[PDB]
Design a protein around this ligand. Structure first.
Ligand SMILES: [Ca+2]
Length: 386
């Protein structure tokens, strides 16, 4: 019994995607997913029947230490990207290649360059980034993966591949963009930013990108109601970018908590005090959250092309009361957000906060790998619930 009010004015070709980057690590850890009926089934087939038509995957250059131990977080590299890509294509879903251009998590605070580009002069790093993108894409193409979109960077609010100067950042952006353009004209190029609540932040970035002639088609944004202000602001701030620079807009990342419980043993990101919780922390609440973001992006008009749910299947590898036994898995398969081996690259965070999943209570599947009714949100927004 899940209610979802039809999204008014939702376009038929609206992108409904999910980012299941951790799916491979979880699978190797023994985690399994089922369907409505309760029978074991490939998550990708389940996602398809749910109305999902796009899949996002993060890609790190070298998410491993000198000895080959994954930093965790899914150990996402070009290899896993292709594995995931192939499966998505096999299920009639486009792929969104999200290049972090880093060996590990990239966000508004961490934009470290791949160890390989560690000490390279800007000129050489620029050409390296172009090569990497070009090779990576050609590789995916060879595997026969349907690539529909490419993200040049992840939440590049203040940096990219060790670069923090917007003049040099723009050049790296075009470098990656150039590779995409040469690979296929139909592929959309997107830049990803976050923190839309910051007064005039997106307006400034849009203008800056334009001043440096950065060639991109989609202006993507993250959206987590816990900290990113109101949906009215999101819609508004994105509409400006669209109207003023004629770019398509979209939400690259978003999610919500369906339970306050942590069934993994590793403390979760939400919910917590100080965080904004406009919807109840329940399956219905989570569905409302997603349905509203879709509405918010749709209200942008022609420019709003889609929404991406972030990690809807990063469920626990085992019960919370097996912490010790889980730690083993997280460490061996990198099925957690980070492994101790990531300390060499990020001694700050992952260095002494490595562990399991922090978003298992924000998935569309339960702790047992079974789909929650909130997974049907992707269909209901079209018609609604009887
Ligand atoms: Ca957890």
């Amino acid at each position: 019994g899940l209610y979802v009010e039809k999204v008014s004015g939702l376009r038929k070709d609206f992108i409904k995607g999910v980012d299941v980057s951790s799916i491979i690590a979880l699978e190797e850890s023994g985690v399994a997913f089922y369907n409505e009926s309760g029978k074991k089934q490939d998550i990708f087939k389940t996602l398809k029947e749910a109305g999902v038509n796009y899949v996002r995957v993060r890609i790190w250059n070298d998410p491993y230490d000198a000895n080959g131990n994954g930093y965790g977080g899914g150990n996402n590299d070009l290899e896993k990207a292709i594995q995931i890509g192939k499966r998505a294509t096999a299920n009639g879903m486009k792929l969104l290649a999200d290049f972090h251009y880093s060996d590990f998590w990239a966000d508004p605070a961490k934009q470290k360059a791949p160890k390989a580009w560690a000490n390279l002069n800007f000129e050489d790093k620029k050409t390296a980034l172009y090569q990497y993108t070009k090779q990576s894409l050609k590789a995916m193409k060879a595997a026969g993966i349907d690539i529909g979109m490419v993200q040049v960077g992840n939440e590049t609010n203040g940096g990219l591949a060790g670069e923090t100067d917007w003049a040099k950042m723009s050049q790296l952006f075009n470098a990656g963009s150039q590779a995409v353009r040469e690979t296929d004209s139909n592929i959309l190029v997107a830049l990803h930013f976050t923190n839309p609540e910051t007064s005039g932040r997106y307006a400034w970035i849009a203008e800056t990108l334009h001043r440096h002639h950065v060639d991109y088609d989609v202006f993507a944004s993250s959206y987590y109601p816990f900290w990113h202000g109101t949906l009215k602001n999101l819609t508004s701030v994105l509409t400006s970018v669209a109207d003023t620079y004629g770019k398509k807009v979209m939400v690259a990342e978003t999610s919500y908590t369906y339970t306050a419980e942590d069934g993994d043993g590793h403390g979760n990101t939400a919910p917590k005090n100080g965080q904004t919780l406009n919807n109840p922390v329940t399956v219905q609440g989570q569905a409302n959250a997603v349905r509203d973001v879709i509405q918010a992006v749709s209200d942008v008009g022609e420019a709003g092309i889609g929404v991406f749910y972030w990690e809807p299947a990063w469920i626990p590898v085992g019960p919370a009361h097996r912490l010790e036994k889980n730690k083993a898995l997280w460490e061996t398969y990198g099925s957690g957000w980070a492994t101790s081996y990531a300390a060499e690259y990020d001694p700050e965070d992952a260095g002494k906060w490595f562990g399991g999943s922090a978003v298992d209570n924000q998935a569309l599947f339960d702790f047992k790998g079974r789909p929650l009714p909130s997974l049907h949100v992707f269909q209901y927004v079209d018609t609604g619930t009887p």
